[PDB]
Design a protein around this ligand. Structure first.
Ligand SMILES: [Cl-]
Lengths: 107, 107
């Protein structure tokens, strides 16, 4: 019933120390994007709210720049950064769409 | 981090009658972007701070918005039995979820 789909930047590799762009895109729906959250299973990274702008959560402020667009740029990568990241689009009237990216930080 | 959700709890109600599902978000000053009413599988309604109520079309006959941020179900059937979720999408806090289990009865 819900027609939106999400593309993402895929399952990726960067190396210890570097940077990476996390990005998604919502296709195939005319619904309004009211907010995008970036999260892990257990943690919030950042929110773009259509009305209010970007908020980066304090534990990531140091090493995360908003954008480009609705994406996120991770800096100073460590091994601990390995795992799943999620771009969560909150929309009206369709509701929540979620894309997934797996990151692996290399030895 | 700081918010908590009260709900109307776990409920029994009678085949054919009506019920109010309600949640309240406390202990956070964060702005509520919208509140989704969902089952595990499906969206029932969204109340969005800018756009107002959307009642999802397949539920329009049996779900009336309100009171406030809650939902009223009418003409319950045994299928209506299950989990309902009130999912607050907020800035800068993120998502808080309240749970309500509905068990619908004969006699
Ligand atoms: Cl807002």
């Amino acid at each position: 019933m819900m027609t939106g789909t999400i593309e993402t930047t895929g399952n990726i590799s960067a190396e210890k120390g570097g940077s990476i762009i996390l990005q998604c895109h919502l296709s195939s729906t005319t619904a309004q994007v009211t907010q995008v959250n970036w999260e892990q299973q257990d943690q919030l990274l950042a929110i773009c709210n259509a009305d209010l702008g970007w908020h980066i959560s304090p534990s990531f402020k140091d090493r995360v720049a908003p954008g480009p667009g609705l994406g996120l740029t991770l800096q100073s990568l460590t091994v601990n950064d390995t795992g799943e990241y999620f771009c969560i689009y909150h929309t009206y009237p369709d509701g929540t769409y979620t894309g997934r990216i797996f990151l692996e930080v290399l030895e």
